[PDB]
Amino acid sequence: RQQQQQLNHEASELLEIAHIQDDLLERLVADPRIPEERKAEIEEFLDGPIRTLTDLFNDYADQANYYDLCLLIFHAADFHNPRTIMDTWNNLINQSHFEAEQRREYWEIVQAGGDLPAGVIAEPPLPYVYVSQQIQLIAHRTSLDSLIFPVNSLLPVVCAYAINNGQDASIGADPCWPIQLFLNLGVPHALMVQVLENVLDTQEAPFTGRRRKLVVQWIAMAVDMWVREVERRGAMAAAVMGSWVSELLGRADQVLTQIAGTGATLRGGAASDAEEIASLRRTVKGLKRSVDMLLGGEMARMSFFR
């Protein structure tokens, strides 16, 4: 069995590298922004024996700014470097945002009569939709167990992008879209709330001032899903949550009381979000109630008939 596994493992690693190399070669040959003279040179060195991950990264993936394949390379190489990983995530998000904005612009010109730039093939997804498509494609290929998904660093960055680029209600997007994304991808509920707590305590920009209203809304949505999950898992077994989650919702209520007060005394006139915040207060209290009941004994009596 040992000799079998060692060969199955060598073939699995070399197959992972080979697919990366094939994805690169195909993309480079098809890229409009690559001169023909270079493409023939790329085809010579990549359509043959499998190359090392260093070369694939330095000589090709990094030169062409294929940041998604850079991340797959950091995964195949067991690359321990959080800072470079996050730099690559930041470049991939920004590159995709600019590409989505460009395609929506070209569209708006068609729907208005103008002419596109020469050699531009004529309702493309909003930028936050194309961005999260990129995150999904990588996650399914790396399985979320990778070091290219440090949720403690990657979730705040994605939330930062949503704020600093208005990927919120103004354009008709769900303001909780970053949370939906990572939950559906299979991030455990406890880890989400744990990170969101750290976002709220440290107050790193842009998560500052009255925009912590949005952080509280994410916490509300995450805890809500967590409660639903626990209730579902209890019914499941008929046929972890600590007091820290309750404390976190209390502080969240205090943040909302602070934001509303500051909003009422702003220069130029009171803030327009008065009832929007009053609603969030009710939701947060409802969640603290549910969490308090579960913590107080209703969680050990979930498999029992009522």
Partner: peptide
Amino acid sequence: KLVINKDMRTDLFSPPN
């Protein structure tokens, strides 16, 4: 085994020779 070396590469956007 990966080793990044931004120093000396080959200009991916320039022909050879």
